[PDB]
């Protein structure tokens, strides 16, 4: 009964907005696995120009 | 394995962040007068050409 009425309140109308979050997390993740090479580039070659 | 160089942006970050941060009103107060003389030059642009 406890753990029915935890999850009840955690989980009450909840649809979709973990649609949501499920559906933009996977868009994300996608698309920033696609734009790695510049993420990769920008991580590496931004120091130079800020320290400098 | 490139998070050391993402410490080094953040810190480089931050203390560019502070050193722009002191500099800045004398930057902005040089362009509002640098705004004068530059609507000064435009205005007489043709006469500038002609010196």
Same mark, same amino acid.
């Given at each position: ?29 996608? $698309?920033?696995?696609? *734009? ?8 590496? *070659? ?7 | ?24 009103? $004398? ?19 043709? *006469?500038?050409?002609?010196?």
């Amino acid at each position: 009964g406890t753990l029915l009425d935890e999850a009840a309140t955690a989980f009450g109308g909840l649809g979709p907005s973990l649609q949501r979050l499920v559906d933009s997390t996977q868009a994300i993740a996608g $698309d920033f696995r696609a *734009n790695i090479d510049p993420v990769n580039d920008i991580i590496e *070659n931004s120091g130079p120009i800020i320290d400098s | 394995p490139r998070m050391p160089q993402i410490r080094r942006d953040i810190t480089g970050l931050a203390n560019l962040g502070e050193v722009y941060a002191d500099a800045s009103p $004398d930057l902005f107060d040089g362009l509002d007068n640098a705004v004068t003389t530059a609507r000064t030059l435009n205005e007489q642009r043709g *006469n500038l050409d002609q010196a």
